[PDB]
Nucleic acid binder design. Structure first.
Lengths: 85, 50, 95, 100, 49, 158
DNA sequence: CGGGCTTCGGCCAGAGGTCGAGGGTAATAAGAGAATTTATACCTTTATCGTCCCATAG
RNA sequence: AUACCCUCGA
DNA sequence: CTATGGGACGATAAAGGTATAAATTCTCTATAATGGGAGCTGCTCTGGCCGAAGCCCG
């Protein structure tokens, strides 16, 4: 449970704490391959995986490691709902 | 759901008419539950078919 | 009865054509509040819409024939929280 | 401001200084820092809350949030790569105005 | 019931439904009756084209 | 198929419908080019799980094996505990932990290497390998028997 | 006679019923070619983990 | 399956 | 006479090399060209906000 929702100014430090990456590229999706690009507005490094419990390369497809981030695939494998938080 | 209303003069004050299709669509999970409880349907595909 | 919902806010779409449900807007919510009926209002704005983990569990309960209605928290409030945060003003809870 | 609040008997001035006191005490109590008003870093909305809903036929429908975010990102990238080469002051200030 | 029996207020409604053959990335979609996993009676209602 | 139906039912019971069809996933799918609805499919999965549990109630070991092979969460934990109780009744706490780790490794759960199991337990690789070889055959026989027993009721109930 | 001090006039913000229902419309042009990185593809080298023979402790 | 515009009903 | 730890074994997956074609961004072209343009005008009130102009005033 919870109560007493607060409102305040956002600190740059707490803004960093909120974020999961540094968006740096303006473009969103490549016209050739239809996956979000690095440092883009939909990048898997920052916002999460496109498919639930999957990574960019498919190095790990099993439904077992839900928090581990692969070596080649730095995009942590997790549930697709995480693109909302 | 919604529909045009119609006066029902044979209705008691506590009740209202409801079309067969609207009632069947709205109460679909209840119908599925009762069908499974009575055993008339085994799989939900059979219940949907009925 | 149940169907696809909007992708941003997990609410049923609108209009025969997209299936869709009628909206308990502000006035109908006020009408329910004027009645003492709070459980149907809470289930109406919580279980019938805007809750992912609530809809499926309520469907389960209806199929098994028990009406428990585990509440959860609407997804639209989460969307509001993230929008206000993206406006650069902090939101939290006192737990 | 508290010391100077009762010195002036003007109603308008006392009202303005009372509003000043209210804001200052609010900042002091609320744990809020005045420098946070000017954001040196801003967030970006999660992608599903600013989605691009593809139009049928292979087109993509971009939300206004995506357009605005793209504009901000482009102007920020322009800013860094024009300060790193020491562009003249006028164009630098114009770019800062555009980013604002 | 005469007004329905005499069929006075019946009306004819014509509605249209469309299909477009898009240039899909893998290939063009073809208007063919061999729909994959298609039942027989429904195919019987359809033609060869 | 009975195995496919059981696997799908277990997966749908373990995982809720999901927040939505992901917008990026939806966008990627729609730009790169079932008879029952989501809630209906989930209700079907629950009904199938209930039917499988009721039919296999005559053999607790078979139900535990099915839960371990397909189900997750509390059902997976119960199946693993029942398998440990059956295969290794008098195992010591270290032996019980090693057996549980090996059983989890059988179901692709972590740890994924017998070396990690030895590190977490201290058992010899020979004994662990022999135990795994025997348990794999025993569990395969039990699962085949359970599937054979449940195949007829699955076709009977469609 | 400057000066607080009240008052008034110009300027901007915000807000304006709900729920349907249907229909429609949504957004373009440098080539060359050099260069740099990156995903690919084959191959070798080391460790790892599945695997079984063997001596032995009870 | 997103926003405007138009038309219509209470 | 038997179960178990110990040690030997070996088939393969990962690690690194290591080039190699794709691919994807980067850099140039030399008559001259040296302040944009759609922007509504037919709300209505209320409310607040500054800023100026009289209004006491000692």
């Amino acid at each position: 449970e919870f109560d007493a929702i607060r409102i305040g100014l956002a600190s740059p430090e707490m803004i960093r704490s909120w974020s999961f990456g540094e968006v740096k590229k303006p473009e969103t999706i490549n016209y050739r391959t239809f996956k979000p690009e690095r440092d883009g507005l939909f990048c898997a490094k920052i916002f999460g995986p496109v498919k639930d419990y999957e990574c960019l390369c498919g190095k790990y497809k099993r439904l077992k490691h839900r928090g581990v981030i692969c070596e080649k695939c730095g995009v942590e494998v997790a549930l697709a709902k995480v693109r909302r938080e | 759901g919604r529909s045009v209303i119609t006066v029902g003069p044979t209705l008691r004050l506590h009740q209202c008419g409801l079309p067969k299709k609207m009632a069947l669509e709205l109460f679909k999970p209840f119908i599925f539950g009762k069908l499974e409880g009575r055993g008339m349907a085994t799989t939900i595909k059979a219940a949907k078919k009925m | 009865s149940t169907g696809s919902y909007s992708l941003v806010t997990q609410q049923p779409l609108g209009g025969k054509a997209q299936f869709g449900g009628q909206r308990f807007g502000e006035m109908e919510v006020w009408a329910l509040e004027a009645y003492g009926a709070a459980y149907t209002l809470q289930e109406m704005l919580t279980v019938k819409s805007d809750d992912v983990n609530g809809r499926t569990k309520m469907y389960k309960n209806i199929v098994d024939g028990d009406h428990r209605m585990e509440a959860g928290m609407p997804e639209s409030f989460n969307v509001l929280i993230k929008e206000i945060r993206s406006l650069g003003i902090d939101i939290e809870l006192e737990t | 401001l508290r010391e100077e609040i009762p010195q002036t008997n003007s109603e308008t001035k006392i009202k303005k200084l009372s509003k000043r006191l209210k804001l200052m005490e609010a900042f002091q109590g609320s744990g809020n820092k005045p420098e946070w008003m000017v954001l040196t870093v801003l967030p970006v909305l999660p992608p599903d809350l600013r989605p691009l809903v593809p139009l049928d036929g292979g087109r993509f429908a971009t939300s206004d949030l995506n357009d605005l975010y793209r504009r901000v990102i482009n102007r920020n990238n322009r800013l860094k790569r024009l300060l790193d080469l020491a562009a003249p002051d006028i164009i630098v200030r114009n770019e800062k105005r555009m980013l604002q | 019931e005469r007004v329905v029996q005499e069929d006075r207020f019946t009306t004819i409604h014509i509605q249209e439904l469309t299909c477009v053959a898009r240039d899909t990335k893998l290939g063009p979609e073809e208007i063919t009756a061999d729909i994959p996993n298609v039942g027989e009676a429904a195919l019987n209602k359809l033609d060869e084209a | 198929s009975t195995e496919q139906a059981l696997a799908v039912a277990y997966w749908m019971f373990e995982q809720q419908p999901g927040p939505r069809s992901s917008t990026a996933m939806v966008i990627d799918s729609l730009r790169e080019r079932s008879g029952l609805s989501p809630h209906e499919w989930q209700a079907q999965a629950v009904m199938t799980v209930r039917f499988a549990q009721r039919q296999l109630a005559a053999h607790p070991l078979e139900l535990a094996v099915v839960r371990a092979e397909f189900a997750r969460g509390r059902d997976f934990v119960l199946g693993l505990a029942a398998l440990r109780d059956w295969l290794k009744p008098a195992a010591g706490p270290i032996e019980q932990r090693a057996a549980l780790a090996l059983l989890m490794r059988m179901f692709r759960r972590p740890p994924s290497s017998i070396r990690e199991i030895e590190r977490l337990s201290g058992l010899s690789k020979s004994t662990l390998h022999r135990w795994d070889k025997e348990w794999r055959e025993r569990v395969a026989a039990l699962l085949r028997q359970a599937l054979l027993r449940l195949e007829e009721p699955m076709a009977q109930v469609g």
